[PDB]
Amino acid sequence: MGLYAKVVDHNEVHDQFTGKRIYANDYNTSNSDEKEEFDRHFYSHFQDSEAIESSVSCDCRAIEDAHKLGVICDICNTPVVNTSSRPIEPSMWVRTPKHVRSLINPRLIIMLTGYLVTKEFDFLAYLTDTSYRYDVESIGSKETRRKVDRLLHRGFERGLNHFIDNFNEIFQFLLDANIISNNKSEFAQFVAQNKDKLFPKYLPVPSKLCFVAESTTSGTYLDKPIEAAIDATLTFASIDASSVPLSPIKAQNRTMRGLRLYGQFYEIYAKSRIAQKPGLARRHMFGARLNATARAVITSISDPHDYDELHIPWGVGCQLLKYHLTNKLKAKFNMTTREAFSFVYENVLQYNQIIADLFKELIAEAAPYKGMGCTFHRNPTLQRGSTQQFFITKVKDDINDNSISMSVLCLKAPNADFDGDQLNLTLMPDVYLTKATERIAPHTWVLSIDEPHEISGNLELQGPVVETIINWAHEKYLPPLEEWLK
Amino acid sequence: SQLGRREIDLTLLGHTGLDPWYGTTSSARGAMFVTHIGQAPEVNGNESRYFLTGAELEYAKYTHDVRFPEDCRVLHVLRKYPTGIGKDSIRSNPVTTIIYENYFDKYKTIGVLHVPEYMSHHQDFGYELVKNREVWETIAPNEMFSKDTVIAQSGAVKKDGTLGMGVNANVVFLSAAGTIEDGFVANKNFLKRMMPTSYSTAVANAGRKAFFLNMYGDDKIYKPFPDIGDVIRPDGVIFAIRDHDDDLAPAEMTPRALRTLDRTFDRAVIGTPGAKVIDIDIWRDERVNPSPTPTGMDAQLVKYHTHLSSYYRELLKIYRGLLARRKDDLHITEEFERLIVTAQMFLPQPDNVRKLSRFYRLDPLDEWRVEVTYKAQKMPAGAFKMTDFHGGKGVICKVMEDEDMPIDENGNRADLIIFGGSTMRRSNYGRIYEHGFGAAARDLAQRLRVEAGLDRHAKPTQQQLNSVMGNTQWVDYAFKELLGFYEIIAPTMHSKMMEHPNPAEHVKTVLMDGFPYIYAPVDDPVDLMAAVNKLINSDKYRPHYGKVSYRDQAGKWVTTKDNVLMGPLYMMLLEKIGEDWSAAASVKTQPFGLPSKLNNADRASTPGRETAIRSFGESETRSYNCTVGPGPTAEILDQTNNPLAHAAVIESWLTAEKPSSVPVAVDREKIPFGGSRPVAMFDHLLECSGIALEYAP
Amino acid sequence: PDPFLIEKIRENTPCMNPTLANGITVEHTMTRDPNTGVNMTRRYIDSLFDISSVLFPDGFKYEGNRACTPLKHFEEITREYNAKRIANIAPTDMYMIDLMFSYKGEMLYPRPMLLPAFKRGNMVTINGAKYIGSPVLTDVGFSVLNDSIFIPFRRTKLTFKQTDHHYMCNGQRKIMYVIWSQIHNEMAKRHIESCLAHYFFCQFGVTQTFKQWANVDVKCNIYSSAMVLVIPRHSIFATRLIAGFWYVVDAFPMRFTRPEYVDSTNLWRVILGHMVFHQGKVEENIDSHLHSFCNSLDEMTIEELKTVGVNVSTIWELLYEIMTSLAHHLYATDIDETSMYGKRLTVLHYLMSEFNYAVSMFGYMFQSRRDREWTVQELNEGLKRSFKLQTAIKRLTVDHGELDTMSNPNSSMLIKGTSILVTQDRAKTSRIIHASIAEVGQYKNQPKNNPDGRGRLNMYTKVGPTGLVERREEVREIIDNAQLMFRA
Amino acid sequence: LSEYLATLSMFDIAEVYNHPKVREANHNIEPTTYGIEKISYGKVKEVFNDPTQFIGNSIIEGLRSGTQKTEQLLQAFAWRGFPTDINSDIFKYPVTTGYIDGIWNLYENMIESRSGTKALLYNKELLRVTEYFNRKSQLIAQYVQRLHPGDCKTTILAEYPVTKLTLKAFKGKYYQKEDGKLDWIRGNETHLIGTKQKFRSVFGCNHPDSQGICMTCYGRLGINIPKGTNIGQVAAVSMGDKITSAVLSVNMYEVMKRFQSFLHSGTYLKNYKSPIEALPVFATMANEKISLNISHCEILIYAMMIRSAQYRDYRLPKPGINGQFEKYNRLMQCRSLGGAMAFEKQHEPLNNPGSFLNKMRNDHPYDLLVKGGKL
Ligand SMILES: [Zn+2]
Ligand SMILES: [Zn+2]
């Protein structure tokens, strides 16, 4: 029934969290000992451009043995987990500073910033920061100055603690004074229903994986949109690291500056990293680089053939079907895994009779299907036909041919040609997906989708074949019918 | 229009001047031809074209070669490697370096000139430099040479002055099923004459982190990589390196373990099997105390480094002697100046000063750096690209034995089969004239061969030609027949050929070559279709027009009902032979847990590119969600986005009795949905901001 | 083939121009003088410092450049920093020179500098990668695009545009064109645009402006706003001057309270500074600005305009001819935009742009600090601050449109080598037909970037010693006849 | 038929070239558009269409069977004509020769080259625009998912005018003729032109499925659709395929922009009060340039419909005659968050207060991928 959005309760997330909890408030960056520990938990640091030669590890990289999986490290107090599947969880937490009522959900700040913040006078800082300064004369717009005069005449008390304690009154006034001049009814309903989850006591710092620091021979490289997150976290740390303890007013002013920095980060990160063409959503949530795939140029199968069969080159067959061949080699020839892997990689660039026999046995064992199911993709993908399901029925015995031979009866549907067209092949791992991808079998684009009771023009024969037929059918090889009857 | 009148000459056409029939081809196809000649690698069977516009002579003047820039005097000749019979001897010397002096100069500038065995301005295509024997054997100290004297050049530059840009092929225009979608049907013997050569370099680094393995040695000899003149071993491995670990010495350092390459845990560099190594360069860091290389693993490394150090030491010695004699009067070229800088970077530094930290574009060198250059010859077979000189691009789609290709009644065997119908749809009719006129020209030369008593196909010998030239009446008659053909097909050529000083020599050349070469300038004043009509209605120069016989795709010997004409076409190979194919069953991931991109260091670690292919974009998932369905579409994505699901797929293949008939790969009860890393990252970021996406109740 | 046939074919075939075929970048960068043995690139460096000597304080001289020995070349690129000597072994085609300066007869510290070397076929290797350096076809003197006259100097680039203003003459409303240009850059950092007549009034007096150039005795024909200026009843230039004067006055009327103050000089400068930018700072600031403006016409730019036929010796003479002789280019241009005949193949102006930038900023530092005693230590620090080891070559493989990666699968030098031509529009990172393409370009060679055939160079083109494209007479008639039919 | 291969050579060219009537259509011609394109080209077309001429010729036999085309052949055997410059401007003088004879003078050769320059254009921008247009229309159309076979037995019909331009587009549509019986358009009912008929329409369906319709209301074109296919995607693909083919091969780019502005409401679809009044306007607009079936037209318009704008109910209306129209941007952000997360500016829906209020919403195929496969 579709998807909608909810509001999470941060302190409930805090309560249900498992493991020792690290708070960024308890860190003085000035002490060089504490800075190193802070960077241990915040950044995921890479000391060079060298490949990580480890599969599992603890937090502090003291244990890199896969047989110790699940054992808790004694130095970092972290269980040994498998990398590439490590759970994504907050790296730290932010407590409520001294003489501060509570924190603010960053979602509420982002919504308010859309309305309250203007080019000449923002209203959120005025209501929350006592150190914000303004010039009424400098305002050069009638609408904003009218709003400013109305707010000043109202006589509110500047301060974060006052703002949190009296929020219904301030929020109501913002609606009445036309400060929030859009979606007044919807915004009121949102606040009136989620007011119990808008002022948390703890806020989670994003995961260690989000912030990646790469140190090279030419300096350390960082992602610019991460900047606000670093600044927000350090700001809360400096509250208890100040040499002179901060007065309650100064504590609130610094707390609000940190919260305003968190709101800036999430909005900018969503705008710049989640929501764009090479973003998280459009590149990885709705797309992927798949395993067990191949890519090569194409040629034609012009000899008598079945329209839904495919021929792959020798080199593609060896690398694509590596684990299929390894299974056969171990069983038939009593090879070890090391020997089988060595045997397969050795014969990628040369013909081998034993490998060729195994290829046919793999194809013949795909019964009752003609061969191994696969899907062939042509880009750009617009119509049904640019994605088709074929069956691998033959691995070419000539190693100099590095093309995938395609049936000549299925070239019009994807508008495929032989001039530098690299197509993408995807191997189906099991029978369940082979049945599923039957929906894009070549026969599924035969019937026209433009005109009823008609066959699409994709089925028409190619030029060279038609010329041969008309050279035969329309030859004047017989006398006229009148002469035939004499 | 006054058919038979042309105004444009060579100076206004540009690269189009290489086409004698530019006027009969559409502008779109003419542009394609000019692009094509810039993408054509040199082949082994290249030869001069049958029809010449004269522009080939100019293009043969400007090629990348080795020259003497100015009138100079040879001072020193250096060889990189001492080819001899010594204990440490190399089979061949790759590079010869010449130091000369411009003695016709006020300042007597001293320069350097290198003479390698090849050149390569392309990523994966080059050519061999053929040394000029007369000049090469002369070269010695205290010898003077003239400006613009060629020492070595490519084999394309013929001695006559012509240029080899392609190979002439017998072509029949037929509608065989193998010609679908601009496909070519190629004779196997023809493809042996269109073989390109590729030159490439492999680089390895060893030292504090890893050591070389014994890939080319035996139980008594340690030889990490092949020598100069050797060939790459059949599996294609050039060299491999293993990590340093002392605690595993009884396992990883046995003589057997040093000979066995582990694909999973070692790192190798793989090239073309059977390729011949032609050059080696080694850089060593000598100020290491102690060297991390184990003893007995550097005999080959030291042998090449010692000879290389001697070569650079002599270069630096020569300059210092020159500087002593010509204080403030020594002028050197910019090339020589950079060469001396390289020598100082190579030789060790004096102990009084700090050592050098060598880098290659922000990459720090280890103790050893080895560079190996090898050359391989490619046999075109399938997916290779070809085109004529009229824009008719095509792809080789079928290869047949020589005995199966079409053959006419006179014994001519076709090299290619091309669909003729596409000519009318693209309006490149220069195809027709070269084919049609070449057929008439070829038949005329063969007819004179038979009339003289020679074999019409075999190349005649000197004894046969001498006897043929004895008869004068036939020689005079043969010359007139050639002139009569020239009058029809080439008017400008005909006028020049009227006053041939030695007509017998022209006839002798034609019989030996088996083809009369035709000069066809772009501004030739000839009516083309009037010439075609003359040839058809002629009793002398009418080309043979009959049936052909070939073996069809069913293995049956058949003969065509229609008359088929066989003629020549100038063909050239095009780049992108499809050698960059990719295929991988499992790929290496990132710390995040997703497939990673491939850098240059990992490009050659496998015989073929093992890269994950983005076969499911956002557009494809839009199409799959509608046809296949959202259900199965999510399964396909999760098998990669979730690394644990991918691990389940591999185990299913390995444990299955029939790996190609697995019912279900991922057991969704043991590994349920919800483990995809991109989705988990999406949920985590939104949760921190304070929101979550949920199903509507 | 028959040996006699080849000779007859060769006899009947014209030859290409060897300068273009062998590569013109090599001919323009590495050719050495027989007398002195110094190449073109080093001579170009000397000429750059000759035109910039007018901004040098007394006693400061440029002594030339010298070639460095390979030993010093090796020592400079392996200089020790942080107890480490980094050596880059990736092959490059570079050589080193020293820049010599002296102060009151005392030689200062030489400044080493790296320069690129080119080989046959416009080939150069930079940091292990091969490149091709192609010439750029550029306009000589000035360029016209759309109501704009672009004039490039060695230190500046100026564009001249047009605006219309209304003035009342003898009780009759009239419209005249006002030529303006933006010469100060903080004006861009900022309504009236800087008028050329306003600059004339800032330099000369209004009466002096009219009498010296227009030979008009302006008083106080009667011209008024829409204050009186009176001219005898017996020009277009004077009309433009009047229009610009009223264009300035109308939007700043408070400043001209008394008519006599019009003939002053400080008031015009105050108005100009308020346009660009406190009165005290403004008055002093422009007095330096007009000082630099009066010295902006370098010798090299003068010779370029001389070829076109402009004949200007001072920057004020150039402004006069823009308002008098080149004014019609703003609305009715008589120069064909699509032509390729009156252009020049230029190499060094685009190759040495970064070094030219350093030279200009060095001269500007002296101008900004006039009337100051210079110490040897201060000069040495200034020279080190501007002329560094890799100043000239630091962006060759970044944003230079005439340098491109090399990919040649065969041995030919012409096909994608010395026949590549770069248009002026793409020099730093189409048009209708013209018969000149058949003579200068290759109208059938149509790459994707330049489908009109102007991206390739005809190998038979006739080129002068300085790179000027000349016309071939033997094809003059046929080219001319086609051009008429193209526009008919 | 391996013995009956067709061949080409200069012998075939001579046969067509030497015909007396072909040789007369190249002499004594007025160098004008009328003289060349109509008189000279007319004579050659007459010869090529005579069944008694060129018997057994490879070139002509292919022309009769559709292998060749007269446009290319006329420019080869008759006068080439008037090529245009890169700015689509024509030249005063023509090319007085065909390709087979050749063009060997500087003026005519150069202007002919401009055709090759015109061939290569900024297709990179065209690809970018077409891909964006296709993606945008497909995402919204996918909200109409299923097509059920059968008949829903509705008394709601639709009154549509029938014209000479849209008669072909009505193929397969069931219309109620006299005596209250259903018949479907076969495409040759010329007597119906200029009248108004009562059609079974998508907007009148009463199928229980909240995002589906029955076969009868869709028309007989639904027989060709494979089982289980998203019917909305089919309509968008059909429209996108024809526009993309025309754009890449009045500019069709302006046509694509015109369709986009009309459907997405920025003479906008939101102006009209009922879908019945809007379909003939869109059908005439669509069928004037491309050929789009009425069934596809109804689906695209139906996707832009909402139940109640006042109460912010953006679900599809059922039946479709009780709904209103809405802009594209508001619909893509307020129907389902799964579809919203796949188009543009994904941060904006997260800030919208309406996204957090419990509402009845339709679903999108991308909903599953947002949750990673969970149900
Ligand atoms: Zn640990
Ligand atoms: Zn219905």
Residue numbers in the entry:
A (entry chain A): 1 to 486
B (entry chain C): 2 to 698
C (entry chain E): 2 to 191, 201 to 230, 247 to 252, 263 to 270, 273 to 315, 320 to 471, 484 to 542
D (entry chain D): 137 to 385, 532 to 548, 568 to 676
Question: Which lines from the publication concern this structure?
Answer:
While most bacteriophage-encoded polymerases are single-subunit RNAPs (ssRNAPs), ΦKZ is one of the few bacteriophages that encodes two non-canonical multi-subunit RNAPs (msRNAPs): a virion RNAP (vRNAP) that is injected with the bacteriophage genome during infection to transcribe early genes, and a non-virion RNAP (nvRNAP) responsible for transcription of all further genes needed for the assembly of new bacteriophages to complete the lytic cycle. The ΦKZ vRNAP is formed by at least five polypeptides (GP178, GP149, GP180, GP80 and GP176), whereas the ΦKZ nvRNAP is formed by four subunits (GP55, GP71-73, GP74 and GP123) which are homologous to the two largest subunits of bacterial msRNAPs (β and β’), and a fifth, GP68, with no detectable sequence homology to any other protein which is responsible for promoter recognition and transcription initiation. The fifth subunit, GP68, is found at the same location as bacterial σ factors, and conserves some of the structural elements of these factors, suggesting that GP68 has probably evolved from a common ancestor with bacterial σ factors.
We have resolved the structure of the ΦKZ nvRNAP initiating transcription from its cognate promoter, p119L, including previously disordered domains and regions. We found that the trigger loop insertion of the ΦKZ nvRNAP was located next to the GP123 middle domain, enclosing the downstream dsDNA. The upstream dsDNA was not resolved to high enough local resolution to assign its sequence, however we were able to dock a dsDNA model tracing the phosphate backbone. The GP68 CTD exhibits the same architecture with and without nucleic acids and was in a position suitable to interact with the upstream DNA through two different interfaces. The first contact involved a disordered loop (415-427) that was placed in a similar position within the complex to the helix-turn-helix motif of σ factor. The second putative GP68-DNA contact involved an extended loop (445-460), which would contact the DNA in a more downstream region through its tip. The electrostatic potential and the amino acid composition of both the disordered loop and the extended loop (which are rich in positively charged and hydrophobic amino acids), supports a role of these two GP68 CTD regions in DNA binding.
